[PDB]
Amino acid sequence: WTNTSGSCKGRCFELQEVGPPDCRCDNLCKSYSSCCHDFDELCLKTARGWECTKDRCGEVRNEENACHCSEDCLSRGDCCTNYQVVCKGESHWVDDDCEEIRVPECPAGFVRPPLIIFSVDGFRASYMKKGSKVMPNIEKLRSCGTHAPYMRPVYPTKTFPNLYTLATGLYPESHGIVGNSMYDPVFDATFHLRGREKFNHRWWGGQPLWITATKQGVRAGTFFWSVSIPHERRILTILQWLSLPDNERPSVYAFYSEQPDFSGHKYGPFGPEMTNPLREIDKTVGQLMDGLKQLKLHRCVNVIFVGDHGMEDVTCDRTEFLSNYLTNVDDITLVPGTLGRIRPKIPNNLKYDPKAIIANLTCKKPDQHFKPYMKQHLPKRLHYANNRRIEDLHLLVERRWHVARKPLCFFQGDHGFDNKVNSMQTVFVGYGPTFKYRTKVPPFENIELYNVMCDLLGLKPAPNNGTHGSLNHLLRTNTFRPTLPEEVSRPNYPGIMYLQSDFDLGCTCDDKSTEERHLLYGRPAVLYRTSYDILYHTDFESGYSEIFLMPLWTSYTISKQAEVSSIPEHLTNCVRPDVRVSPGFSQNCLAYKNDKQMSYGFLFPPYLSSSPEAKYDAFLVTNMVPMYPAFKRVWTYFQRVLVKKYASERNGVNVISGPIFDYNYNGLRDIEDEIKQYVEGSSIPVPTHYYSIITSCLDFTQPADKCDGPLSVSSFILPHRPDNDESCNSSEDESKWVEELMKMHTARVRDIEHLTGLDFYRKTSRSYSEILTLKTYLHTYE
């Protein structure tokens, strides 16, 4: 029980924690119905609006007014933000020429630059092109500070998952806020954007910035604002807090606007009606900047202007209904819209038939505007599976569409789609002494920002999914010096030790400076305990695992001119034992011969052999991996057609390929115990995915093997599945569907590192920070 009889006199937006029975006056009291009886009266004044006018200048102080224009207002820290312009002949900040801020220019008593996070909801990256004609304050921040052309949100691209990802550096599957709405089967409770359940702390995992700050003795302003508090009051509050005594002043502040999201939903992102909302946000940024200038802080504070996601054209006319595919939709609950998550209406309903549901949802219309996935089958780049609140059955919805349960307008915009979709991209600008001046940086992911905000505040980040150092290039100072991870397992280098006669594997082969060329960036470091051999070959090198009975990685270079050679008919089934590696640490062809479902393939493709001679190396048992025929359709097309196409287009390519084991879909290398499938009658483990990392010279005029500067990389993590049900056109020639599949399963090198325990690019001519940026790159194909 809270005693509302108390008073917020001299307590408005106090920062001290106050629990029952005492009543509160903080920004969040209204949400807890714990405000004192005079909160709204004392703390939420509106009298005379938010702007000084000439007739108010040097007024006598009336405490009833929203903000003040009296002579004392400055030292009391509560002038209207435009007070000096109107009353003292100063200029608005926006009208001042930009000037490099080489070091913080902070008043007496400031030990470090404060950080202000200005978050805007549904701010599509492309809105920035509207420029100073619509958003002059924001355009000044953008042009004079550090900006990216866009920032990638996390999936699903909705507000709660993204704001909490911004605060924690975590994927939703890790922080727990996996949607704006979710059901937790253990709590047997439901979380909604609106309603009180979300206030319960059990939902929120990881360690958000305000807690990290507090635990390290850095004070934080509020990172929540009650919907009922006007933006102007939020801004005045921040400025008032910045005017507090040195021993009370917070170091980090957050402002949030629910625009332009609201207007985007109503009108769509290209509506002329979007101009007004964007002007209003800009006016708010100007209030803040004018306010800071009034306080002599405008060259002291670091400002981050950042969105949570974008906005797409989505109308009533573009809605798929499950009732068109399924007989009884009244027995399922659907989290609907720009994504789908399906569970039985009655929790744990035993008659729930997921395999039958998925079958009825797979490739049933030619123009079908969604695709069902069991969550372990979603592209690994989404990192959307390892949480009990994520339903097994997911629908990935096509951009511009909605999915609804049944048929049983006022909206022209929505968001939530796949986070590589252009319309979902959002904004990032950093401005202030710690950011660079007039600098553009490539797009990056929002999971990276937590580390950077920690850097900006002198904090040590809690464990998270950013790659610390990958954004060092945004900063003038306060960069993080990353350290190379230490290798855990050194390789063996086996020479010949056996005779062809030593081998009884069931394999038949009818007819009978490698590094320099093939490990352009050094051998990958193995970061776990295991046993593996380096193997050299004319055309490729590999780290062959004696535990998993196949390479952890296979590395090879293909020059622009390389010749694609066929596999001779007599070599079709050719598999040759490898006299460097024990029969006991080898696969055997008998397992394949007998497994009626599983075939095999090669990591180094015989099609790219450097001579009919060398091609015999490609058929070694130590180059072979278990592949379903369905997967082989993809992999052969890749090996035979695509690698050469890339070599041709990029002036040669360096390729590293290998298996991934992630049976528990946690995005991390499986230990032996977690692997759940083996080739029939054997102990050959079956990968859940195969990866390829394709590197070349950023300057395409230089060949990959003779690159002097920055690198270019694209990579994939392809699902190893027994059918091609994912690809609706797979009945056609591979040229009609394989690349489309591959694009959906594009990945970062960093993703592959998590999934393999390998560390790549350890020997290059670039800085470690640059390499970290390279490893976080995602080739989107948009």
Ligand X SMILES: *[C@@H]1O[C@H](CO)[C@@H](O[C@@H]2O[C@H](CO)[C@@H](O[C@@H]3O[C@H](CO[C@H]4O[C@H](CO)[C@@H](O)[C@H](O[C@H]5O[C@H](CO)[C@@H](O)[C@H](O)[C@@H]5O[C@H]5O[C@H](CO)[C@@H](O)[C@H](O)[C@@H]5O)[C@@H]4O)[C@@H](O)[C@H](O)[C@@H]3O)[C@H](O)[C@H]2NC(C)=O)[C@H](O)[C@H]1NC(C)=O
Ligand Y SMILES: *[C@@H]1O[C@H](CO)[C@@H](O[C@@H]2O[C@H](CO)[C@@H](O)[C@H](O)[C@H]2NC(C)=O)[C@H](O)[C@H]1NC(C)=O
Whose CA is closest to 230, among 266, 274, 283? 283
Angstrom distance (rounded) from CA 103 to CA 434: 8
User: Does 415 appear as a known binding residue?
Assistant: yes
Stretch that binds Ca ion, among 107-115, 404-412, 669-677, 715-723 (CB under 5 A): 669-677
Chain positions 557 to 596 lying near K ion, rule: CB under 5 A, are: 592
The reply on whether position 209 binds ligand NKN by CB under 6 A is yes
The reply on whether position 357 binds ligand Y by CB under 6 A is yes
Q: Which does 261 bind (CB under 5 to 8 A by kind): ligand Y, Zn ion, K ion, none?
A: Zn ion
The reply on whether position 81 binds Na ion by CB under 5 A is no
From residue 140 to residue 179, the character string flagging contacts with ligand X as x (rule: CB under 6 A) and all else as - is ------------------------------xx-xxxx---
From residue 721 to residue 760, the character string flagging contacts with Na ion as x (rule: CB under 5 A) and all else as - is ---x--x--x------------------------------
The reply on whether position 312 binds Zn ion by CB under 5 A is no
H helical segments located in 673-767: 738-744, 749-756
The reply on whether position 386 binds ligand X by CB under 6 A is yes
The reply on whether position 485 binds ligand X by CB under 6 A is no
Shortest separation between residue 647's beta carbon and Zn ion, angstroms: 42
Stretch that binds Na ion, among 25-33, 464-472, 491-499, 720-728 (CB under 5 A): 720-728
The reply on whether position 599 binds K ion by CB under 5 A is yes
Q: Which of 27, 157, 159, 387 binds ligand X (CB under 6 A)?
A: 387
User: Does 261 appear as a known binding residue?
Assistant: yes
Q: Which does 666 bind (CB under 5 to 8 A by kind): Zn ion, Na ion, Ca ion, none?
A: Ca ion
Beta bridge pairs of residue 653: 558
The reply on whether position 330 binds ligand Y by CB under 6 A is no
Angstrom distance (rounded) from CA 250 to CA 210: 11
Check whether the bond before 21 is cis (ω within 30° of 0): yes
The H or E element that residue 84 is part of is helix 83-88
Torsion 512-514-518-522 (CA) sign: positive
Shortest separation between residue 642's beta carbon and K ion, angstroms: 24
User: Does 308 appear as a known binding residue?
Assistant: yes
DSSP single-letter state for residue 156: S
The reply on whether position 326 binds ligand Y by CB under 6 A is yes
Of the pair 117, 618, the CB lying nearest ligand NKN is at 117
H helical segments located in 620-748: 629-637, 643-650, 738-744
Neighbour tally for 779: CB within 10 Å: 16
Q: Which does 193 bind (CB under 5 to 8 A by kind): ligand NKN, Na ion, K ion, none?
A: ligand NKN
Angstrom distance (rounded) from CA 576 to CA 578: 6
Q: Which does 146 bind (CB under 5 to 8 A by kind): ligand NKN, Ca ion, ligand X, none?
A: none
User: Does 708 appear as a known binding residue?
Assistant: no
The tokens describing 413, both together, are: 């915009």
Chain positions 7 to 36 lying near ligand NKN, rule: CB under 6 A, are: none
Interface with ligand Y: number of residues (CB under 6 A)? 9
Whose CA is closest to 287, among 149, 83, 73? 83
Reported for 1-7, long-range contacts at CB under 8 A and 24+ positions apart, including other chains, are 2/32, 2/33, 2/34, 4/34, 4/35, 4/36, 4/37, 5/36, 5/37, 6/36, 6/37, 7/36, 7/37, 7/38, 7/42
CB 236 within 8 A of CB 81: yes
The reply on whether position 368 binds ligand Y by CB under 6 A is no
Of the pair 361, 755, the CB lying nearest ligand Y is at 361
Q: Which of 258, 331, 353, 680 binds ligand NKN (CB under 6 A)?
A: 258
Of the pair 384, 661, the CB lying nearest ligand NKN is at 384
Q: Which of 191, 241, 256, 521 binds ligand NKN (CB under 6 A)?
A: 256
* C-alpha torsion 767→770→776→780, nearest 10: -140
Q: How do 599-602 and 624-627 pair as beta strands? A: antiparallel
Reported for 11-17, long-range contacts at CB under 8 A and 24+ positions apart, including other chains, are 11/36, 11/42, 12/42, 12/43, 13/43, 13/222, 13/237, 13/240, 13/241, 15/219, 15/221, 15/241, 15/248, 15/250
Shortest separation between residue 425's beta carbon and ligand NKN, angstroms: 15
* DSSP, residue by residue, 545-585: ETTTTEEEEEEEEE-TT-------GGGTT--B--TTS-GGG
3-state secondary structure 295-306: CCCCCCCEEEEE
CB 717 within 8 A of CB 667: no
The reply on whether position 122 binds ligand Y by CB under 6 A is no
Angstrom distance (rounded) from CA 636 to CA 563: 16
From residue 185 to residue 204, the character string flagging contacts with ligand NKN as x (rule: CB under 6 A) and all else as - is --------x-----------
Angstrom distance (rounded) from CA 477 to CA 455: 9
Q: Which does 730 bind (CB under 5 to 8 A by kind): Zn ion, Ca ion, Na ion, none?
A: Na ion
User: Does 313 appear as a known binding residue?
Assistant: no
Q: Which does 463 bind (CB under 5 to 8 A by kind): ligand NKN, ligand X, ligand Y, none?
A: ligand X
From residue 156 to residue 175, the character string flagging contacts with Zn ion as x (rule: CB under 5 A) and all else as - is ---x----------------
Q: What are phi and psi of 229, to 5 degrees?
A: -95, 120
The reply on whether position 224 binds ligand NKN by CB under 6 A is yes
Reduce the DSSP state of residue 175 to 3 states and report it: helix
User: Does 265 appear as a known binding residue?
Assistant: yes
User: Does 180 appear as a known binding residue?
Assistant: yes
Q: Which does 599 bind (CB under 5 to 8 A by kind): Na ion, K ion, ligand X, none?
A: K ion
DSSP single-letter state for residue 638: I
Chain positions 169 to 188 lying near ligand NKN, rule: CB under 6 A, are: 180
* DSSP, residue by residue, 481-545: ---PPPPSBPPB-------GGG--S----S---HHHHH-TT-PPEE-SS--EEEEE-SS-EEEEE
Of the pair 29, 326, the CB lying nearest ligand NKN is at 29
User: Does 664 appear as a known binding residue?
Assistant: yes
Q: Give the residue carrying structure tokens 């549901």.
A: 357
Of the pair 595, 705, the CB lying nearest K ion is at 595
Give me the catalytic one of 2, 146, 157, 159.
159
Of the pair 93, 203, the CB lying nearest ligand X is at 203
The tokens describing 694, both together, are: 């394709």
The reply on whether position 664 binds Ca ion by CB under 5 A is yes
Of the pair 546, 680, the CB lying nearest K ion is at 680
Angstrom distance (rounded) from CA 363 to CA 354: 16
CB 236 within 8 A of CB 78: yes
The reply on whether position 735 binds ligand Y by CB under 6 A is no
Whose CA is closest to 642, among 712, 551, 562? 562
Shortest separation between residue 457's beta carbon and ligand X, angstroms: 20
SS3 content of the chain, % helix, strand, coil (to 5): 30, 20, 50
Stretch that binds ligand Y, among 2-10, 160-168, 261-269, 525-533 (CB under 6 A): 2-10
- Clarify whether 467 is annotated catalytic: no
Angstrom distance (rounded) from CA 32 to CA 199: 9
Shortest separation between residue 780's beta carbon and ligand NKN, angstroms: 22
User: Does 369 appear as a known binding residue?
Assistant: no
- The footprint of ligand NKN (CB under 6 A) covers 117, 119, 122, 158-159, 163, 166-167, 180, 193, 209, 223-225, 254, 256, 258, 261
- The footprint of Zn ion (CB under 5 A) covers 121-122, 159, 261, 308
Binding site listing: 121, 159, 180, 261, 265, 308-309, 415, 662, 664, 666, 668, 670
- The footprint of Na ion (CB under 5 A) covers 724, 727, 730
- The footprint of ligand X (CB under 6 A) covers 170-171, 173-176, 205-206, 383, 386-387, 463-465, 667-668, 754
Residues noted as catalytic: 159
